[PDB]
Amino acid sequence: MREDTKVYDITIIGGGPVGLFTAFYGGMRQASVKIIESLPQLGGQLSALYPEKYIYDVAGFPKIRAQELINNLKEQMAKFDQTICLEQAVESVEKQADGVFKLVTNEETHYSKTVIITAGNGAFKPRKLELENAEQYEGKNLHYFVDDLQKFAGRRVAILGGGDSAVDWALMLEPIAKEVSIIHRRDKFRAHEHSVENLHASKVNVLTPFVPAELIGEDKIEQLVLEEVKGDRKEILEIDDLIVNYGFVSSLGPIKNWGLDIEKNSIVVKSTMETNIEGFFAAGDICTYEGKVNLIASGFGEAPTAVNNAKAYMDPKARVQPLHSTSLF
């Protein structure tokens, strides 16, 4: 456990589109801002679940690719300073006797005058490989996320999964790795058909329909045993790295342990976006109220409402209504 003893003005739980616009608006109100995000990337549902898809109902965009929207939000907030804490899932939020919120994650303890939760459906986490010794290889050569293609250069790689992630990494690693194998439990992939076309055309070693049976290696993974689906025949791969792309899981989890008024897996908010805990606000898919719709455009309206009311809560001399952006820059 580490501890950040800077009391931020606004600490945002979740770096999806709504959290990103919340962060931007915090900057507009000259507030110190921290984003805490479970994944090693920002972008929430858009980046994790449909980065390639075109969205048609965000105000002002006849169409926009989901990842492009996320990148635009990142560009928007780039004019201001934010502290971004990735690979941290908030487990505890408590308002201390002095009024300051203490937030504790799996890695670090944080402090804030206000908290704005923009957590969607809860903390995104990778689906884990359900093998007894799999955890022991985490932080060695068992990978759930890929942050650097070049670290596989000249190495033998096995990839588990049949989705766009597994297929994309396989094709991205083909020209870099010494050897790439992809293992999927079905002859049919989930990945986009054009990507699958490219996969079968490539020199990637496709193994279907197989599931991973065991990991052999005293310290580092050395061999991967596979078993055929609807067939009694084992396969053994000599590998240097194992990449697991079994998709994402989310749950509110400990979000339900903080004394919040929660209905139907959503945090209930007043029209100010404030929860039942003073100084604790919510916006986006995580929040609810009579008439709430889970949309990006709805979240993008809730974000500035939360920020501007948070600012007025912190500074009794500050007005809820912000100045015109057209003159501020």
Ligand X SMILES: NC(=O)c1ccc[n+]([C@@H]2O[C@H](COP(=O)([O-])OP(=O)(O)OC[C@H]3O[C@@H](n4cnc5c(N)ncnc54)[C@H](OP(=O)(O)O)[C@@H]3O)[C@@H](O)[C@H]2O)c1
Residues between 31 and 70 with contacts to ligand FAD, criterion CB under 6 A:
36-39, 44-46, 49-50, 55, 57
- With CB under 5 to 8 Å by kind, the binding choice for 270 among a copy of itself, Na ion, ligand FAD, none is a copy of itself
Task: Identify any residues that bridge with 237 across adjacent strands, giving them in sequence order.
Answer: 224
String of contacts with ligand X for each residue 202-221, x by CB under 6 A: ---------x----------
- With CB under 5 to 8 Å by kind, the binding choice for 37 among ligand X, ligand FAD, a copy of itself, none is ligand FAD
- With CB under 5 to 8 Å by kind, the binding choice for 164 among ligand FAD, a copy of itself, ligand X, none is ligand X
Residue 186 within binding range of a copy of itself, rule CB under 8 A: no
Sorted by sequence, the CB contacts under 8 Å of residue 64 that are 6+ apart come out as 54, 55, 58, 72
Instruction: Quote the least distance from Cβ 49 to ligand X, whole Å.
Output: 5
Sorted by sequence, the CB contacts under 8 Å of residue 130 that are 6+ apart come out as none
- With respect to ligand X, which residue has the nearer C-beta, 250 or 272? 250
State CA 48 to chain mean position distance: 6
Among 1, 99, 293, 317, binds a copy of itself (CB under 8 A): 293
Q: Are 144 and 244 in contact (CB under 8 A)?
A: yes
Q: Report d(CA 303, CA 23) in Å as an integer.
A: 9
Residue 159 within binding range of ligand FAD, rule CB under 6 A: no
Q: Are 238 and 216 in contact (CB under 8 A)?
A: no
- With respect to ligand X, which residue has the nearer C-beta, 65 or 155? 65
Residues between 32 and 91 with contacts to a copy of itself, criterion CB under 8 A:
50, 53-64, 66, 69, 72-73, 75-76
- For tokens 């209905």, the residue is 263
Phi and psi at 226, nearest 5°, equal -115, 155
Residues between 127 and 146 with contacts to ligand X, criterion CB under 6 A:
127
- The answer to whether 315 is a known ligand-binding residue is no
String of contacts with Na ion for each residue 255-274, x by CB under 5 A: -----------x--------
For residue 151, the SS3 value is helix
CA distances from 190 to 76, 80, 184 (A): 34, 39, 10
- DSSP letters spanning 158-215: EEE-SSHHHHHHHHHHTTTBSEEEEE-SSSS-SS-HHHHHHHHHSS-EEETTEEEEEE
- With CB under 5 to 8 Å by kind, the binding choice for 66 among Na ion, a copy of itself, ligand X, none is a copy of itself
Which residues are annotated as part of the binding site for FAD?
37, 45, 50, 90, 124, 285, 326
Q: Which residues bind ligand X (CB under 6 A)?
A: 49-52, 127, 161-166, 168, 184-186, 190, 192, 211, 245-247
Q: Which residues bind Na ion (CB under 5 A)?
A: 266, 285
